[PDB]
């Protein structure tokens, strides 16, 4: 807490919940997730940032577990970036509908139009900003 928390000593906006599942279930999900990535064309996994992402050649999008503390990066590809949060168990499910949402959205208008875009769990709502901040935004 020496630094990086200054004013924010602790993340107040937290569910303060606790895990109620055995590591066995998570381990099984991990193997399933890895298998999906193996047969998932355009998807890559990194051990350093245990995460997966898919590139369309126009922009880079990546998915992460329930934790989004790693969604931030200091590397830019010069292309729009999409932050997607989803559970490993429902990871496959999130891409099935999430991918569809992006494909449909890109059809009507390129996603490159929005400087900053972000996706949320199926239950959560998704929205994009033209300049990353403004009254004008898109939601699906």
Task: Give me the secondary-structure topology.
Layout: H1 23-38, E1 43-46, E2 51-55, E3 60-64, E4 81-85, H2 91-108, E5 116-119, E6 127-129, E7 137-139
PDB class: protein binding
Keywords: Inhibitor, protein binding
Assembly: monomeric
Structure notes:
Residues 1-23 are annotated as: Disordered. This is AcrIIA5. The chain is an alpha/beta fold and 140 residues long. 24% of the residues lie in helices and 21% in strands. The chain is built from 2 helices and 7 strands. The chain has a 7-stranded mixed β-sheet with strand order 1-2-3-4-5-6-7. A hairpin with a 4-residue loop joins strand 2 and strand 3 (60-64). The longest helix is centred in the C-terminal third of the chain and has 18 residues, at 91-108. The chain is globular, with a radius of gyration of 16 Å.
Summary, kept brief:
One of its GO terms (molecular function) is RNA binding. The protein is an alpha/beta fold and 140 residues long.
**Annotation field: number of helices:** 2
Supply Rg: 16 Å
Instruction: Tell me the number of strands.
Output: 7
Structural class: alpha/beta
Distance N to C terminus: 38 Å
Domain tally? 1
The coarse silhouette is globular
Strand content: 15-25%
Q: Record the strand order, biggest sheet.
A: 1-2-3-4-5-6-7
Largest sheet: 7 strands, mixed
Query: Element order, helices and strands?
Result: HEEEEHEEE
Question: How much helicity do the residues have?
Answer: 10-25%
PDB class: protein binding
Keywords: Inhibitor, protein binding
Assembly: monomeric
Entry title: Solution structure of Anti-CRISPR protein AcrIIA5
């Amino acid at each position: 807490m020496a630094y990086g928390k200054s004013r924010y000593n602790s993340y107040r906006k937290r569910s303060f919940n606790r895990s109620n599942k055995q590591r066995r279930e998570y381990a099984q999900e991990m193997d399933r997730l890895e298998k999906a990535f193996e047969n998932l064309d355009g998807w890559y996994l990194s051990s350093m940032k245990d995460s997966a992402y898919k590139d369309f050649g126009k922009y880079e999008i990546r998915l992460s577990n329930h934790s989004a503390d790693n969604k931030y990066h200091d590397l830019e590809n010069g292309r729009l970036i999409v932050n997607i949060k989803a559970s490993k168990l429902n990871f496959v499910d999130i891409i099935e509908n999430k991918l569809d949402k992006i494909i449909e959205k890109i059809d009507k208008l390129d996603l490159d139009k929005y400087r900053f875009i972000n996706a949320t769990n199926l239950e959560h709502d998704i929205k994009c900003y033209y300049k990353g901040f403004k009254t004008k935004k898109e939601v699906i």
